[PDB]
Amino acid sequence: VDISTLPRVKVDLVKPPFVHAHDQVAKTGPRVVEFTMTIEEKKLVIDREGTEIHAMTFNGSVPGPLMVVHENDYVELRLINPDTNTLLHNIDFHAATGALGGGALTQVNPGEETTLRFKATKPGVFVYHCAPEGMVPWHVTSGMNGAIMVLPRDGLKDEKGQPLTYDKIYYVGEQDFYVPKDEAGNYKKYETPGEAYEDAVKAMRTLTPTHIVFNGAVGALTGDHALTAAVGERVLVVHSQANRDTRPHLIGGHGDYVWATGKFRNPPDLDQETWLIPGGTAGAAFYTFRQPGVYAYVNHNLIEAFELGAAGHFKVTGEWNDDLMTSVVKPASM
Amino acid sequence: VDISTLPRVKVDLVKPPFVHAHDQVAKTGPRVVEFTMTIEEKKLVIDREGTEIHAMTFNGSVPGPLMVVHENDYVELRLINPDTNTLLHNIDFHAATGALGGGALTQVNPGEETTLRFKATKPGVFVYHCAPEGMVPWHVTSGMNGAIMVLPRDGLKDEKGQPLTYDKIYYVGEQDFYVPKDEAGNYKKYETPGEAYEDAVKAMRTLTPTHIVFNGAVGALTGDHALTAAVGERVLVVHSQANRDTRPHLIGGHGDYVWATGKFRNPPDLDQETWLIPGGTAGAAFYTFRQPGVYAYVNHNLIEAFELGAAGHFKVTGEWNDDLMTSVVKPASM
Amino acid sequence: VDISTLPRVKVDLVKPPFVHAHDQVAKTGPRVVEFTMTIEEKKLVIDREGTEIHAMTFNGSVPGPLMVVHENDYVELRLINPDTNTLLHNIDFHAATGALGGGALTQVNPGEETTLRFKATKPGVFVYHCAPEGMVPWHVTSGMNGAIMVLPRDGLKDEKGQPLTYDKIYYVGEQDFYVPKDEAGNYKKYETPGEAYEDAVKAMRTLTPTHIVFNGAVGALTGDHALTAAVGERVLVVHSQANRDTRPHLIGGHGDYVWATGKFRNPPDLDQETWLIPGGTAGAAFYTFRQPGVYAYVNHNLIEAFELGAAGHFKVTGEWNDDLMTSVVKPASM
Ligand SMILES: */O=N(/*)[O-]*
Ligand SMILES: */O=N(/*)[O-]*
Ligand SMILES: */O=N(/*)[O-]*
Ligand SMILES: [Cu+2]
Ligand SMILES: [Cu+2]
Ligand SMILES: [Cu+2]
Ligand SMILES: [Cu+2]
Ligand SMILES: [Cu+2]
Ligand SMILES: [Cu+2]
After folding, report:
1. Out of A42, A236, B23, C10, which could bridge A166 as a Cys pair, Cβ 3.0 to 4.6 Å?
2. Which residues lie with the beta carbon below 6 Å from any ligand 2 atom?
């Protein structure tokens, strides 16, 4: 079908962990879904100590926002690199076919823009990331990655073919940072990106992250920004990691249905405690909450979670079920 | 059904790698299954060089013992922290739903005890571990973790729905330790847990284990303590890793049916050489032995196996099958 | 059936990434398939800087060559250790059952040979590697590993039971090296294998590779040695890693059908972006190319790919499909 004959719909993106509006089951035929993102190089404070890095972002956030389409829609992205930036950037979609996922067609210097179109032929959650030839891991590990969800036209299905419908969705982007250290162990800072580059390469080659965070900073998904749900609600958590493996776990819950490597033509794994999302992948977990209270959502290398930053919280409202769990005898000396 | 109307059964636990008595197919309706564990802080020698650490244990062992129930039983655990210990502890069951897996309800100071009940609503093998707020990875990586198996009421099934019945079961707990080192590379020792804490945190933040062991020490599952089997026996090996990925492999055999991420509502993977158990997970592998002799069972990062400790042995009795394997010409000069 | 009554066929191996001739669907009954490999200790330059190591090889290459048989054939390997070598070697097949995969029966000193036979009872791709008692990870991480493919007698099948037939096959062996470094960070060199051994053990115990390469060196699968295909061709990429996890990704494509842990009795995962091959495993991915141009094939820890060596290329011939992807507005200032 001639693409100029299809409907166009413009999406207005939101900041993670929230997700723009969409319908699980497609309410129209295939469409050209129009997105715009503006690259922003910016300083970000990433820990409680005040460590400040030069982040490279899509739309001002780490991770970049979640894009949502259906299978056999066309994604049309206007990518803007304002002249207030200093570096060359591009974009590679793991959802796309050809030209390095789009990276070979989207190289933009400061003061340039470009528009890419691709057909979303495979359903699943997928990573997108910047990847300029010769400086790929530097851009990705400076925060320049997000994800796209390509829903089946008839929505999600369980291992038997019956519908799975979520009530809420969140997007957790997990970021490994490599902040250069001196011989004594303290972070260095740098005056220009070029003066930083060799020590960024040195720091990356150790293979050891200094920080591993959700939504761009230690503690970002806690306090006033904890995730929320109610007892009985069905929640989909999309989780991406563009560079290193992670092992997500809902402390106090499970992944009732999990696509660990993110592709919806496969049946989900049931009843997971913890699952492996390989570096370079997006995964998705569906859970129905059964108990109120605080939960933590972590990478279950618990050092990475509780010392390096890879931990967030849910606050869940509703009634407690003593059949599922109860304290029979509360802690006491006797 | 009112829980006070159900049968109660008391379990008497055994030391790993052995497993307490149970029936694969449930011989009764749902029960309250009663367990007791006593926390023990103790010194342990973990390598051939004599390196001694302060371990934190459930029931005196690293790992803690394997607990076994059926789906929709209630687990009722009496957890005792004697006044000979010095620290606060608790317990989180990945099998349980609510209150951080039980951790929010089981905080016991030295000289206290508590009793927790939860309904085992999902079948599989699952990690349990201590997790005190603010010091979670320290307790877990001091050895304070084990596993629980929740069997389907009608026992295990293959990828086609037919029964799988084991003749023997073993539990291998794999432990990553982070023993602090001085600048020259030698381990330090410490006079109190508080004086140790900052350097334990420093050691953990390197993300690099000093030791990775089965059943609490280098060589623990060898010699007089090698695992055993006979040709033709069906063996289930439950394997847990509460903090880091592992990649188990039976040298000379296979995993004929493997639940790599441990949850029995999913069909097993067939004919595995090696499989990935993510950190924070228990997995299980079923094998029927076909050849006698010595086997090694390893994490197949072979550095981790043969230099850091992650290797045990089977000794298998019976007749050799020359159709499966034979030396046609023995090593010789010619 | 008496093995002396079966047909014998002699295979002549080829250097990776190419694969010797075979038929996907078996054209005969079960056979004794005869292979010969000669061990070669040799110097190899592994990076652009000229770093030279002492490699330990099967047949002169890192990885060793891909062997191909069908399920229930017998593999008969003549393994030769010439007197120009200095070390003891052997071979363990993850495809085989008993005697440590063959390692206990194949110990050859320089100037010796041996012939091993085993029945290939399980279909899949599997690692083979040297494993001499007490020096296993040293030999494996010096390059002494390859893979064997055991095809189902009726060829490969998809998740629904229909045939999958490849037009081309390649074998990518991925090698983690641990070249010892002095305190300043420069590689050391050594006069004899014995004088090298303690520092090789020290380097391995850091768990941090210095190099991670495809086909034995940085850049080996690029330039005049890039992999090739045409639009519309079906390609199987077999990928092994004998010691560490990897996360393969075709940049610009997908794994349409992937056996991540390599065993063909299981249904493949569909539409993968990236997949996890555990250390100690071979995996296989099937893709039909849809677009011409250059692709990169990587470990998607992008530091490991683009700084440490784990990246190769495809050059694909044919016509571009603007429906799948197009530049709507080329990069420009406006
Ligand atoms: O039980 N979650 O660390
Ligand atoms: O073949 N097991 O290392
Ligand atoms: O999109 N491949 O790094
Ligand atoms: Cu960029
Ligand atoms: Cu990528
Ligand atoms: Cu504790
Ligand atoms: Cu946990
Ligand atoms: Cu060797
Ligand atoms: Cu092996």
Report:
1. A236
2. B 249, 251, 300; C 92, 94, 101, 131
Which C positions 284-303 lie with beta carbon below 8 A of chain A?
A: 290-291, 293-296, 300-303
Catalytic residue among A23, A154, A159, A273: A273
Question: What would the two tokens of residue A252 be?
Answer: 């106090």
Whole-number Å distance between alpha carbons of A155 and A165 = 8
Measuring CA to CA, which residue among C274, B209, C300, B180 is closest to residue A301? Answer: B209
Residue C324 falls within a domain, yes or no? no
Same domain, A127 and A275: no
Parallel/antiparallel/unpaired status of strands B163-164 and B156-157: antiparallel
Which of B293, B325, B331 is facing C96, going by the closest CB pair?
B325
The residues near B48 (Cβ < 8 Å, ≥ 6 apart) are B218, B219
Experimental structure resolution, Å: 1.1
Report if residue B84 sits inside a domain: yes
DSSP annotation of B25 = B
Give how far Cα B108 sits from Cα of A189, B80, B136, Å.
45, 8, 15
Instruction: Compute the count of residue pairs across chains A and C with CB atoms less than 8 Å apart.
Output: 162
Tell me which amino acid residue C97 is. T
Q: Is the CB of B94 under 6 A from ligand 1?
A: yes
Q: Return left, alpha or beta for C307; rule: phi > 0 is left, psi -120 to 50 is alpha, else beta.
A: alpha
Q: Residues C173, C311: one domain? A: yes
User: For chain B, percent helix, then strand, then coil, each to nearest 5?
Assistant: 10, 45, 45
CA separation for the pair A273, A9 (Å, rounded): 39
Give me the residue label for tokens 């998705």.
A284
Domain count, chain C: 2
* Residues 6 or more apart in contact with residue C117 via CB below 8 angstroms: B325, B326, B327, B328, C3, C32, C74, C75, C76, C77
Domain that holds residue C89: 1-152
Strand A124-129 to A92-93 pairing: antiparallel
Please tell me which residue of chain A has the smallest CA distance to B275. A276
Same domain, A201 and A281: yes
